[PDB]
Amino acid sequence: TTQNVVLTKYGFDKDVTAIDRATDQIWTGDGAKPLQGVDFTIYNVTANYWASPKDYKGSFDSAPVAATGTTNDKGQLTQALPIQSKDASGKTRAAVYLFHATNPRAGYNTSADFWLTLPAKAAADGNVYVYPKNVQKTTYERTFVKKDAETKEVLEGAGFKISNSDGKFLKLTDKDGQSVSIGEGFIDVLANNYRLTWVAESDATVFTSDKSGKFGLNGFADNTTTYTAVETNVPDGYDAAANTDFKADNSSSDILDAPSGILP
Ligand code: NA
Ligand code: NA
Ligand code: NA
Ligand code: NA
Ligand code: NA
Ligand code: NA
Known part of the structure; x- marks a missing residue:
């Protein structure tokens, strides 16, 4: 019974x-x-x-x-x-x-x-x-807008990885630690119940600027730790942006890609 x-x-x-x-x-x-x-x-x-x-x-x-x-x-x-x-x-x-x-x-x-x-x-x-x-x-988020340095217009399709001071890179997983396919734009980890793990560069999650140049995520543990955004997939015709240090401080900031010069 x-x-x-x-x-x-x-x-x-x-x-x-x-x-x-x-x-x-x-x-x-x-x-x-x-x-x-x-x-x-x-x-x-x-x-x-x-x-x-x-x-x-x-x-x-x-x-x-x-x-x-x-x-x-x-x-x-x-x-x-x-x-x-x-x-x-x-x-x-x-x-x-x-x-x-x-x-x-x-x-x-x-x-x-x-x-x-x-x-x-x-x-x-x-x-x-x-x-x-x-x-x-209380968790924190960070947003980035990818732009063309010359035109100041937004840039779709730019891929990024995120690293910490240990040189490990961010990989999103599901609640059980399994891989998940991550698309363009801002990733809502909270709504999707994802997890932030720190792994080798080759296994890291690539984040991609969407049609409005936007990418990033929420669900960071603190706003004191410094992370680095590293461009790994540069849109054709551009030079990679310098690496961008950031805190998960609920802000948005721009990352600039300079068009590649062509000489005669
Ligand atoms: Na027992
Ligand atoms: Na009894
Ligand atoms: Na409990
Ligand atoms: Na859960
Ligand atoms: Na359980
Ligand atoms: Na993304």
Whole structure:
């Protein structure tokens, strides 16, 4: 015999704190953003808890995995869980489950671990509703406009790589670390739930100026680190721009490409 636990992850403004809600309350978020693609492990902590209930403080040491999952487009993750389970001595008990975020949405801190006993108070539909809490982090972005140095008009199709002070280069991956194909323009890492990794130059992501000359991305961790934009694919008939040092300071600035001279 099991109960359906429905986990819903909402994203909140940095300075707004959610009130606790009972497990029999169906809460729309009012209308905070549902967070898709968030990974949770549910641990069966029945044995850890019943070792000494008054001392339990959220340990999942040696606890088996009851289930894993990922939030969907509604920020939701559903899982049927046995209401009873065994303690360390093989005695049957009311089951205790601990919910552990293993991969938070880009731009968010990991949720706090929480746990509960089953059977729990359920909503009118028979489901048990939980709502993990976390804090949105402040991330930063940078935009560049590629231009013709002579005409001052924007330049489409110029390719760039980005390096850090270690000489490693930026590669965008999906939430699971896999490669992704990146096109032209400003890349919305936050909306796409991408990750910034630092790799060898040959494996780096190439960013390309779009029809308005624009390229760049959001999702930088800080605004103090210096990075370097290096032009790797120069439009035909131009000379490469000098390397451009920058901070992810939410600004936009121009990068100039000089037309190649032709002599008689
Ligand atoms: Na997981
Ligand atoms: Na355990
Ligand atoms: Na018992
Ligand atoms: Na994620
Ligand atoms: Na957690
Ligand atoms: Na791009």
